Design a protein around this ligand. Structure first.
Ligand code: HEM
Ligand code: HEM
Ligand SMILES: Cc1cc(N)nc(COc2cncc(CNCCc3cccc(F)c3)c2)c1
Ligand SMILES: Cc1cc(N)nc(COc2cncc(CNCCc3cccc(F)c3)c2)c1
Ligand SMILES: C[C@H](O)[C@H](O)[C@H]1CNc2nc(N)[nH]c(=O)c2N1
Ligand SMILES: C[C@H](O)[C@H](O)[C@H]1CNc2nc(N)[nH]c(=O)c2N1
Ligand SMILES: [Zn+2]
Lengths: 407, 411
C-alpha cells in the first residue's frame, strides 16, 4: 500500500504515498500491463465536488474551517438546484494548475505553478473564442520569451452545447494528399485539412501552411478564422556547421499549444481549454521531422551529409537524427525563441520529482512518455523508476468533434 | 476476451487472445501501473496443477493432446509427485520448456530466434568442477569462433532449496571492477561487489580495466568454488572506429558472448536455479549501456573531448554525437572481426515481424515496451510506435536473489 521507486544510476529511493489518493482507472490489471497503449448526474457530481474542495481548502490551510463548510453547502445547494455549479476564480486557477501538476505524461511539470490562467467562461460565440485565442497566442509567445498559459472556455452543460476547438494544436501545418501518392506538408493533419477545405478554407497547398482555427461555441457549427500571421512566431531551420541545411526549406512554429483535450475540475468538464508552454527540441527534430508518418526527412538529410545509406549498421539514421536536432535547437536559440533540450528538461524533471515526493508524497509519471525519443539512457529519467496513476483535476483525451458533432 | 494493439506508424491492428493463458502477476492494478519498476521448497498441492498445465501445453504443441501417451504421462508424473514430492522432465519436455521460457520472455527483443536454441542437459552434474566443465563446453560451443550460436545449459533443479545449483556470476563472461581508496573505480563499476567476493574467495586479481572474472560455482547447495575460464575460449573484440583513428587508443574492448547466468528457469512448477543461457549482442547493449551509462564505463566525456565537440552546453548535443560514434565503432569492430552482432534497427525490425507472426499463429506475444525500445534513437525504430501488452506466461525466466544474500555457509 506504500510504494518505493528507485533511481538505478544514483541509488536514490523515494516513497510514494500519493497514489492512495488515485481515483480514475489505469487500464492495467494484475494479469496484464497496458503501460504502452496510447489510450487504455446530480449524484455523480457532489462527491466529485467535495473531493476537489477538500483538496483546495486543505491547500490554503483552511480544511474544516467555516469558510470550507460554507462553500461545500453552497455548492451542494447549487447542484441540488441547478444540476451543476460554478467555480470561484481561485478554485479555477488552482484546478488548472493542478491538472498540469497531475499530467503524468508531461516532462515539463517543474513549471506547473507558473501558469497564467485566462478565464474565458463569459465567452458566447466563435468570434469571441477567436479573440480569446489570439490574445492567448500573443501573451504566451511574448515575442519569443514564451510564457505558459491556458484559456478556459465555458463548461459542459447538457453535452449538446459544448465549446470545442476542432484543431489538435492552435498552430499546426496543413497536410494534403496529391495525385503523386506522396503527401505535401504534414500527413498528421490530412483529415483536419480536408475538414477545413470542406468548411470553406482557401488552401494555399504548400509545405508549411498554418491551418485556420475551427471554433465551435455553445454546440453550434464550427467557424473558420485565420490567426493573424503576425502572431505566429515561426523559426527557419539552419545548422551551425552545415551551410546546405537551410536549403531543405524547413521551418517550425515557436508555440506548442494543445487545444483538443478536456480539463476536469471537481467533476466539471471544460471541453475547450487550449494550453501552451514551450518546446523540448526532440518534439520537433525527432518526432515532427523524422517519424515515418510525419515530415519523414531522414532520407533527404542523410543524402546531403553523404552518409553510407547502404546498411542500417552504419547508423546513418542515428547520425542524421542528431544533426537535425542540433539544427532545431541552434535555430530557436539564434532567433531567441525559448526551447529546452532533452538533457536539461529531463534533469529538471528529476529535480521536480524529488520536490514532489518530498513535498506532496509522490508524482505520477508515465515512463513511456517521459523518456525522450532519442538518446533515452543518456538522460537521467531512463534510470528512474516511476509509478503511473490518475489524479484529478486532470487533462483527458476526448472524442474528435467531427465524429460527435450533430450538424 | 480480445485485446487489441495498434502500431501508430503503420495502422496495423493486432488482436491478443494469448493473455487469457497468463498466470503469474504483473505488479500493476486498476489504480497503479508499475510498468517501469525493474522488479515489482514447493508443496505437492501446488505442484501437480503446474505440472498438468505444462504437459497439456507440451502435448498440444506435438498434436498429441488427449492421446494415450499424454494420459500415461500425466499419471506417471502424478504418481512420481505423490511418491517423491517432485518429478523429472523427459529430455523432450526440458527442450520444449527452455525454448518456451525464451519465447515467453517479454523483455527480450531477440525472440525471433526462439526456436533455434541448443539445449545442453546438465542434470547429471554433481560438483562445481562438473559445472565448470559444462560451462566451458557451452562457451566454446556458443562462441563457434565468432559465428555465435544460442545455447542454454541446465543444471539440476531445486529440491528442498537447501541443495541449489547456482552460478554466482551474473553473466559467464564479465569484467572485474575495483573500488579504489580515492573513490574512483577501475574496470566495470557494475561488478565491484562481485569482484570483492571473488577476491575474498581467493582470486588473484590482475587489477586492470578489462580483467575477465573467474567463475564462482555452487553445486548441490555446497559452498561455491572458483575457476578461471581458459582465456583461449573467451573471444574478445578490440574496439576501433571506421573514420576516427584515435578511437583505438582509448584502449576499449568487449567480449563477444553475452551469457546470462543468474536467472531461474521455471518449467511445469520445477525450478532450475542454474541455467546459463547465451545469444549474441545487439550493439547498443555495449555501445550505449556498458560504455556510456554513468554507473558503468562512463566514456562519453573522453570520447567527446577527442572529437573536439562543444562541451560547454548540453544543447550542442555533444553527448548524443559521441554516443552515435561509439556505437558505430562497436558495430564496425564486431563486423570486421566476424563476430556476430545485430544493430538496433535490424533487431527491432525483426522483432516487429516476429511479434506479428506470433499474434497470427499463437494469438499473442507478451512484450515489455520499456525494455524492448532501444536506449538510443528510440522513435526511429519501429518498436517505439508499437503498442504492446505485457503479461506472464510459463515456462519462464525469473529473477532470483543474489546467492551471497541467501547462502548458508558450511565453511
Ligand atoms: C513549459 C514547457 C512544457 C514542456 C517543456 C512540456 C513538455 C512536454 C512534452 C515533451 C510532452 C510530450 C508531448 C508529446 O510527446 O507529444 C508533454 C506532454 C503533455 N503536457 Fe507538457 N510541457 C510543457 C508545458 C505544459 C503545460 C503548460 C501544460 C498544461 C497546462 C502541459 C500539459 C501536458 C499534457 C496534458 C501532456 C500529455 C499530452 C498527451 O497525452 O497528448 N504541458 N509535455
Ligand atoms: C539471439 C540473440 C539475442 C539478442 C540480440 C537478445 C537481445 C536482448 C536484449 C537487448 C535484451 C535486454 C538486455 C539488457 O538490456 O540487459 C534481452 C533480454 C532478455 N533476453 Fe534476449 N536476446 C538474445 C537471445 C536470448 C536467449 C538465447 C535467451 C534465453 C534462452 C534470452 C532471454 C532473455 C531474457 C530472459 C531477457 C530479460 C533479461 C532481464 O530481465 O534481465 N535472450 N535480450
Ligand atoms: C503544452 C505542450 C508543451 C510542449 N512542449 N509540448 C506539447 C506537445 O503536445 C502534443 C503534441 N502532439 C500531439 C499531442 C496529442 N497527443 C495525443 C496522442 C494520442 C494519439 C492517438 C490516440 C490517443 F489515445 C492519444 C500533444 C504540449
Ligand atoms: C541472452 C542475452 C543476449 C543478449 N544480446 N543480451 C543479453 C543481456 O542480458 C543482461 C545484461 N545485463 C544484465 C542482465 C540482468 N538484468 C537485471 C535487471 C535488474 C537489475 C536490478 C534489479 C532488477 F530487479 C532487475 C541481463 C542476454
Ligand atoms: C505505442 C507507444 O505507446 C507510442 O508510440 C508512444 C510512446 N511514447 C511516446 N512519448 C511521447 N512523449 N510522445 C508520444 O507520442 C509517444 N508515443
Ligand atoms: C527504471 C527503468 O525501468 C530501468 O532503467 C530500465 C529501463 N529500460 C531498460 N531496458 C533494457 N533493455 N535494459 C535495462 O536495463 C533497462 N532499464
Ligand atoms: Zn501497467
Amino acid at each position: 500500500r506504500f510504494l518505493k521507486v528507485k533511481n538505478w544510476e544514483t541509488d536514490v529511493v523515494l516513497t510514494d504515498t500519493l497514489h492512495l489518493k488515485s481515483t480514475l482507472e489505469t487500464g492495467c490489471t494484475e494479469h496484464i500491463c497496458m503501460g504502452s497503449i496510447m489510450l487504455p448526474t446530480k449524484d455523480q457530481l457532489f462527491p466529485l465536488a467535495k473531493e476537489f474542495l477538500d483538496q483546495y481548502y486543505s491547500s490554503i490551510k483552511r480544511f474544516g474551517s467555516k469558510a470550507h463548510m460554507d462553500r461545500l453547502e453552497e455548492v451542494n445547494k447549487e447542484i441540488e438546484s441547478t444540476s451543476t455549479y460554478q467555480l470561484k476564480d481561485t478554485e479555477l486557477i488552482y484546478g488548472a494548475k493542478h491538472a498540469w501538476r497531475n499530467a503524468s505524461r508531461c516532462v515539463g511539470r517543474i513549471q506547473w505553478s507558473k501558469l497564467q490562467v485566462f478565464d474565458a467562461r463569459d465567452c458566447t460565440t466563435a468570434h469571441g473564442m477567436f479573440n480569446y485565442i489570439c490574445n492567448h497566442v500573443k501573451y504566451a509567445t511574448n515575442k519569443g520569451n514564451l510564457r505558459s498559459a491556458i484559456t478556459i472556455f465555458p463548461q459542459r452543460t447538457d453535452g449538446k452545447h459544448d465549446f470545442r476547438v476542432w484543431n489538435s494544436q492552435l498552430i499546426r501545418y496543413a497536410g494534403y494528399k496529391q495525385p503523386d501518392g506522396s503527401t505535401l506538408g504534414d500527413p498528421a493533419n490530412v483529415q483536419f485539412t480536408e475538414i477545413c477545405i470542406q468548411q470553406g478554407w482557401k488552401a494555399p497547398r504548400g509545405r508549411f501552411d498554418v491551418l485556420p482555427l475551427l471554433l465551435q461555441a455553445n454546440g453550434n457549427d464550427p467557424e473558420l478564422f485565420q490567426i493573424p500571421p503576425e502572431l505566429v512566431l515561426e523559426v527557419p531551420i539552419r545548422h551551425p556547421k552545415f551551410d546546405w541545411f537551410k536549403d531543405l526549406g524547413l521551418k517550425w512554429y515557436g508555440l506548442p499549444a494543445v487545444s483538443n483535450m478536456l480539463l476536469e475540475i471537481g467533476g466539471l468538464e471544460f471541453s475547450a481549454c487550449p494550453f501552451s508552454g514551450w518546446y523540448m527540441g526532440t518534439e520537433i527534430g525527432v518526432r515532427d521531422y523524422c517519424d515515418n508518418s510525419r515530415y519523414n526527412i531522414l532520407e533527404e538529410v542523410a543524402k546531403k551529409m553523404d552518409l553510407d545509406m547502404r546498411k542500417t549498421s552504419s547508423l546513418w539514421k542515428d547520425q542524421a537524427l542528431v544533426e537535425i536536432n542540433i539544427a532545431v535547437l541552434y535555430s530557436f536559440q539564434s532567433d531567441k525563441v525559448t526551447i529546452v533540450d532533452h538533457h536539461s528538461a529531463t534533469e529538471s524533471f528529476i529535480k521536480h520529482m524529488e520536490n514532489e515526493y518530498r513535498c506532496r508524497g509522490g508524482c505520477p509519471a508515465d515512463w513511456v512518455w517521459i523518456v525522450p525519443p532519442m538518446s533515452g539512457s543518456i538522460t537521467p529519467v531512463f534510470h528512474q523508476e516511476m509509478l503511473n496513476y490518475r489524479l484529478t483535476p486532470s487533462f483527458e483525451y476526448q472524442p474528435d468533434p467531427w465524429n460527435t458533432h450533430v450538424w
